[PDB]
Design a binder for this molecule. Structure first.
Ligand SMILES: CC[C@H](C)[C@H]1O[C@]2(CC[C@@H]1C)C[C@@H]1C[C@@H](C/C=C(\C)[C@@H](O[C@H]3C[C@H](OC)[C@@H](O[C@H]4C[C@H](OC)[C@@H](O)[C@H](C)O4)[C@H](C)O3)[C@@H](C)/C=C/C=C3\CO[C@@H]4[C@H](O)C(C)=C[C@@H](C(=O)O1)[C@]34O)O2
Ligand SMILES: CC[C@H](C)[C@H]1O[C@]2(CC[C@@H]1C)C[C@@H]1C[C@@H](C/C=C(\C)[C@@H](O[C@H]3C[C@H](OC)[C@@H](O[C@H]4C[C@H](OC)[C@@H](O)[C@H](C)O4)[C@H](C)O3)[C@@H](C)/C=C/C=C3\CO[C@@H]4[C@H](O)C(C)=C[C@@H](C(=O)O1)[C@]34O)O2
Ligand SMILES: CC[C@H](C)[C@H]1O[C@]2(CC[C@@H]1C)C[C@@H]1C[C@@H](C/C=C(\C)[C@@H](O[C@H]3C[C@H](OC)[C@@H](O[C@H]4C[C@H](OC)[C@@H](O)[C@H](C)O4)[C@H](C)O3)[C@@H](C)/C=C/C=C3\CO[C@@H]4[C@H](O)C(C)=C[C@@H](C(=O)O1)[C@]34O)O2
Ligand SMILES: C[C@H]1[C@H]2C(=O)N(C)c3ccncc3[C@H]2CN1S(=O)(=O)c1ccc2c(c1)OCO2
Ligand SMILES: C[C@H]1[C@H]2C(=O)N(C)c3ccncc3[C@H]2CN1S(=O)(=O)c1ccc2c(c1)OCO2
Ligand SMILES: C[C@H]1[C@H]2C(=O)N(C)c3ccncc3[C@H]2CN1S(=O)(=O)c1ccc2c(c1)OCO2
Ligand SMILES: C[C@H]1[C@H]2C(=O)N(C)c3ccncc3[C@H]2CN1S(=O)(=O)c1ccc2c(c1)OCO2
Ligand SMILES: C[C@H]1[C@H]2C(=O)N(C)c3ccncc3[C@H]2CN1S(=O)(=O)c1ccc2c(c1)OCO2
Ligand SMILES: [Zn+2]
Ligand SMILES: [Zn+2]
Ligand SMILES: [Zn+2]
Ligand SMILES: [Zn+2]
Ligand SMILES: [Zn+2]
Lengths: 338, 338, 343, 338, 341
């Protein structure tokens, strides 16, 4: 039989096939089996609180109307134009902010049918998915971003999604993220939805994203360490040089504040204390205490008498040991806790 | 009866149904009943003065042409392709800046008809809606953002919208906003429009958004408290150290101004006094007064005589008590008022 | 019984009608007189940098098509399904100064079709337009702009099609519509922009909106903080002439604050090559702040030798400065504000 | 003859016209004559290295199939829907980054045919065109931005573009650019392309854009003149006041560097020396030399003896004359050269 | 001769019986497609988003015996692109494409040409944004390798095979330049043959090599950092008694050096490895910070105003005037030799 006539008899004019009717429409729900290949993964934004993926979405279900005997071939690879002629699930991504198909240079779609009427339908999609983030431990945080595959119009009695048994989520070889590490273990689960329009099938996959710490050592933690260490050189400067020691004190405090708000600029305006806030707060405390230290040194030595000059000198010599020692103790606590 | 023939007889070729004609077109207006499920709520922008939602819009109306007896089923879940074949309301969002449908992986639409000809039509939409904001109490403000559902072509004598009686506005479980708290109570009302083209049905829903205060304590109010407290250390510095005390005075004023304009950068250019303006103004007054305080101290002590040196010293000792005390009193007033 | 709607639409503009939408009303006769009016649903995004603004409007067009006249119903008008707009002739109005334009299609096409007994048509369509508005920033931020909107025919010359603003209420504005930076003046000017191209002479009607910039924002974020830096600069005059590092510190940091203030405000504007009002203010403020530093340089220099005659001469420069600097700055403010907030 | 029948006989059902076949397809190439009206011209970006225009593109060619005698009218203005029914050139813009048609409120198109079969086809287009820029003389530069009209599928033996003889490029009355002056003289030329697919017609127009200098006097050259003049006040300050004279020297150098990199922020990251780089370099040299001048003054006067104090004083008095004099000479050279 | 309208009708139209849902030789071996690209433009090379943009003409060549003709003596026929919808064509897609679009102004930017023997030439104009993962370890003396993968979506290796053309598979428009990079003449061609759970799919790849131009960074990064280091040294010629002056210099050079450093990091992605620019900024900041510590030492050892201690402090300064520049010069030798040799 010629292919043109076969397609005509199976799903075309002479077929009497109606794509508005599901497989076994008087019978049990259509069991769809999903799996995704993750071609790319990125644009993980804290501010907009979302991420982007390019995937191949594979769906599998049985349509006894598409079973064939005319060829001995176990499967037939069909032209994607025939997808419009057949019934297919109405899967949508429940937490999708933006989604699109790919049409260059032709529709990036795949249709394959088997002897027994099974269908394989793969379609390429770019999705932007919402991923609410918990920034309490930033930048030592780990996020959990999800992806929900749901039916819009079919209730649980007509259509049921299920992750494939073997390898439901594949990831492209050598795929990396610059800011995160994508953990090998993906959690699969059900998000079965109950709306006032009914009960709807929904399956979910959770990716775990561990933020890479290296960037923050170099661009956040070390340069704050500078400003704190810089603040301490005041303690080796002559107590008579007020303009010099105040200059150091101010400029370290101010550098430390612009450092602090510089890092807050890349994040959303959450109303809870993050780990980076604690660090910047304590660093700023140490830098501010050092200025108060000189204010004390300057003030106790007003009268130029030896007894008072000696008392001021003791404040400096204690400071040279205690400030670094205390800051070292703080680092032990901070790093151990997280 | 086969589904294909039933759809053909009800709204297809052999039906004689005309979707250009409303239900009961010679009779009273079509009573439509709306309800929304809010799948997401965010992108609340002060600068552009708008917000974004992803909703399922449900509409319900009766079309006696679609009543059926051929099946005992109380309702039939139909393929959304049939939405093109039936009449439906021309609801539009009157305050929408941008709107779009969702088409991945198929049109995110739902059609359900009942024995008596009732229709349920749910469609998924991303909307950007305008929300004019009153920033007088920012950042302790609370906004009221609306959403108007209106008919474009049908006047009140052909078509009438109405919110559902039970649960017209549902919100997705666990939906949060990072900057605001969305209040449980939504106001419903009428926006019935009168244009030169006629009188048009319009129903409205108001969401109340209370801005979360926590972010502003950490990134606005506390760091301004620093600069004010920092300004006071000048009062414990030796009056002879002019370059040190002027250095403190300048750099606190300038830090305070860049702090002030830093916060104004995230807002629209409104021409009224906001709460944040008052705070920054008073903080800047306290920081500026402290510099003037030294200018006074320096100036009254020009001649190096004890009577004048004593007078200058009194200005400092009074300042150490009064500046903080006055600033504390201001905080009591400011916080109590808002 | 009366005629069914389906058959009436079929006989009027459908299969059996013989209507051709490629042919205008009275095509051998005089031009089609179209009557336009707009409802302004929103008005905003007034950008100086990109030099444009945005509106959401309902565009109403009215014209007579004797082919669409009917007697089959006693109704004075019939409200028709917008799908029928494709079946009828309609003007090819476009916005001549539009940078971006779009229709609205959620949840259906935001369109309106209404025909009357005598064949008159009312066609309303909802549009978001971004329109170009060349701006004269010479008096910024006390400026007032005039932004236009041109409705023009693309393909029909003046002998086939003519646009005209409605007589009664051609431009309506939504109740309670405000702009945050501007005041939209009640009076809109209507005019003709009749175009002559090498392809012919084309109808074009125009509406001008007047936008008065609100001054309040600039008092708080531009004029008052510059007043600070000038007043701050004066405290140097009460500081001891012996404290050079203190008085130079004040002088530098006020000049530098004043320059970053000045270029901070220029960041929100296009790169025009003419002097604006804000430039004059920042220039004079910077002059007063710079003169104060030069004042100390003079004080410091004349008092080099520590002798009373020279120390006294330097002290006189300071005491004169305490009066003259503020007095001169006050006089400047009188002149500046009188000039711009009069002419 | 009724218009409906005339269009039917000329290019419709009964016409036998095939728009897949060019005019005189066995004969010589179709001679197309182009002209543009420039409705707007702007968005001239240095960073992205492109510009934007809104044009009416007019094309003229003869199609003997569309010649008519049925009406005495010299030309017929046709409904643009008929453009789909006729053959037309496949002109594209070879250096276009983005292009779009205008469809509000109807397609912004014009079709006019003449007795002899001539066609006038005008279409409105927004184009973003690439314009590689030579920034060597910025901001006294003058750019040359082009616009190439090319055939995609027709080789030189089937289709030939040519600029109109009389007034090929019109510009809207009163059209201005804020940063540039668009010169009256446009160059027209040929870009005839040779690809491995063949030889393709291409005509080009070059616009000359002279950058307006006024903005840069006020926001770049004058404020740099300030910092240089400010640097000189150090020379009238007492040599004993080191913290004051070093303060001036540092802050002028640093102001001068942030000024310099502030202006580089608006440009692409080209790897050649621009005119603005030379100016900022020399200004920074004069400001840096002034600091070195004090370092010298301070250093030669270490021992507080008259002979060395006098030698230091001479360095200052020479500096007061030579620094401005040298800077004036530099300005003469710099401005004369460009 | 036969009219064009009838010829197109008999070849691929109503009366032809041609089915574009069926590939050439569908029971036979795979369709051999031969690709070549003309690069009309190349740019928008972004480090942050980690991608680049091209405007290309994509040419595909394959044989369709159904489209062979004898009715005309012409070796090839240039056909109207509307006929592309009527014929079978490969389903080539760009595997590493983030965004892609066709060009439709003023008509579809497409080309169809068929030959006597049924060969087809199909050229289509495309703007592509392609992902190019970057290794910034040597930034800004880095060289990137950006790829472009042409793949079949639906046809497995037994039905469809892509292959680069033998002669001149990748042409580049005359005078095409990039402002930040140099595009190297040699393009590598290779296979990316994909194995998915849906099957084995043809894929061919081209690699462009992009050498970052160094000139910009000398002027806007390396020289201005050289300033701050040289500026830091003037402290050594300032009087040791002038603490506020020498501390002022020390602070402001350190702080200028830190804002310089983080200014340059703003244009890059947030990678968690050490780049070459990080080492430079680190060492510059070390030299500027050491100079401040140098004065702290000078100030501290000279506390008691006695000659023996004043002399010791003075020696720290005189050694510093020679050693600081000398050491910084030695560092430059090492740094430049390592990265540029
Ligand atoms: C009194 C403050 C003075 C000025 C002190 O400031 C300094 C040092 C000098 C002064 C002694 C510096 C200051 C931090 C403070 C110490 C503060 C902390 C260690 C933390 O905060 C405290 C107070 C806070 O309650 C306001 C409290 O939150 C609770 C109660 C709240 O209910 C009222 C509730 O909503 C909330 C969710 O849970 C918290 C647990 O604990 C720490 C979280 C503060 C960090 C602050 C900052 C980090 O970057 C910010 C900014 O980028 C900048 C420029 C400077 C920083 C600063 O200014 O930091 C900054 O604002 O020390
Ligand atoms: C008076 C200025 C001098 C320089 C004084 O400045 C300082 C310190 C002491 C100086 C002598 C600092 C200054 C505040 C002033 C005190 C001012 C206020 C408490 C408020 O304002 C006053 C006057 C103002 O109108 C003159 C008036 O508006 C009304 C009437 C108008 O009709 C004429 C009407 O249309 C308008 C809408 O409502 C107002 C109610 O009341 C307060 C609102 C001012 C805030 C100012 C600022 C907040 O951030 C701004 C900016 O980010 C910055 C960099 C510095 C700030 C500053 O510069 O703050 C800043 O610009 O004191
Ligand atoms: C020589 C200037 C010295 C350094 C003086 O500078 C200062 C103080 C110190 C010196 C005494 C500071 C300086 C202004 C000057 C005084 C100058 C003016 C009041 C005006 O300008 C003069 C000369 C000018 O000719 C270039 C001339 O315009 C030409 C070209 C015009 O085409 C556009 C043309 O339309 C016109 C007819 O003709 C003009 C008419 O009149 C005033 C326009 C200058 C404003 C300058 C500034 C405002 O913000 C700018 C910037 O954001 C910044 C950081 C600092 C400002 C500054 O630096 O301001 C700034 O650059 O005083
Ligand atoms: C057969 C379809 C649908 C329908 O159109 N008709 C006429 C009948 C008739 C009798 N019983 C049920 C129906 C419904 C249900 N089925 S369906 O299960 O194949 C179906 C089809 C399409 C659907 C859908 C369900 O959910 C929303 O989209
Ligand atoms: C039946 C329609 C419409 C119409 O086409 N005809 C012929 C008639 C005939 C007699 N009376 C009224 C009409 C109009 C109104 N009705 S309708 O109520 O179904 C209708 C249909 C579509 C509409 C509309 C109203 O306003 C918005 O767009
Ligand atoms: C009737 C149309 C158009 C046409 O097709 N023909 C055949 C004739 C015949 C005789 N005279 C004029 C025409 C032209 C013009 N008329 S029209 O006035 O209805 C018309 C129709 C559409 C138009 C247009 C003019 O200019 C803009 O686009
Ligand atoms: C007549 C057309 C085109 C065609 O479709 N056929 C069938 C034939 C037949 C015989 N000889 C030539 C052709 C070609 C050439 N002509 S055409 O010159 O009008 C033409 C038409 C469309 C074209 C084109 C050339 O190149 C770009 O796209
Ligand atoms: C002829 C097509 C396709 C088909 O529709 N039928 C009916 C048959 C019949 C017998 N054997 C194979 C088929 C398949 C395969 N062929 S095809 O090789 O031309 C083809 C056609 C389209 C394809 C494809 C392969 O890969 C995916 O897209
Ligand atoms: Zn897990
Ligand atoms: Zn309420
Ligand atoms: Zn007026
Ligand atoms: Zn020229
Ligand atoms: Zn190689």
């Amino acid at each position: 039989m010629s292919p043109s006539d076969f397609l005509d008899k199976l799903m075309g004019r002479t077929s009497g096939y109606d794509a508005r009717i599901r497989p076994n429409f008087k019978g049990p729900p259509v069991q769809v089996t999903c799996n995704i290949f993750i071609n790319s993964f990125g644009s993980i934004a804290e501010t907009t609180m979302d991420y982007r993926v390019n995937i191949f979405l594979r769906q599998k279900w049985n349509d006894p109307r598409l079973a064939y005997s005319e060829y001995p071939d176990d499967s037939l690879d069909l032209d994607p134009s025939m997808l419009d002629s057949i019934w297919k699930p109405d899967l949508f991504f429940a937490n999708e902010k933006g989604a699109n198909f790919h049409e260059v240079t032709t529709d990036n779609k795949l249709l394959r049918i088997f002897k027994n009427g099974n269908v394989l339908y793969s379609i390429r999609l770019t999705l932007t998915l919402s991923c609410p983030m918990d920034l309490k431990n930033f930048p030592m945080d780990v996020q959990t971003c999800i992806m929900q595959l749901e039916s819009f119009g079919y209730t649980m009695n007509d259509l049921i999604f299920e992750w494939q048994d073997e390898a439901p989520v594949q990831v492209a070889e050598g795929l990396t993220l610059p800011q995160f590490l994508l953990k090998e273990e993906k959690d699969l689960r059900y998000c079965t939805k109950h709306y006032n329009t009914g009960k709807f099938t929904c399956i979910e996959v959770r990716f775990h994203l561990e933020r890479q710490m290296g960037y923050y050592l170099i661009q956040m933690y070390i340069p704050s360490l500078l400003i704190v260490i810089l603040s301490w050189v005041s303690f080796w400067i002559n107590m008579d040089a007020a303009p010099a020691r105040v200059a150091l004190g101010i400029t370290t405090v101010l550098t430390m504040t612009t450092q602090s708000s510089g890092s807050r600029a890349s994040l959303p305006k959450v109303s809870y204390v993050k780990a980076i806030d604690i660090w910047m707060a304590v660093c700023l405390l140490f830098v501010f205490s050092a200025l108060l230290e000189y204010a004390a040194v300057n003030f106790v030595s007003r009268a130029g008498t030896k007894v008072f000059i000696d008392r001021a000198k003791k404040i400096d010599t204690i400071s040279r040991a205690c400030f670094p020692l205390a800051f070292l103790i703080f680092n032990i606590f901070y790093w151990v806790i997280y």
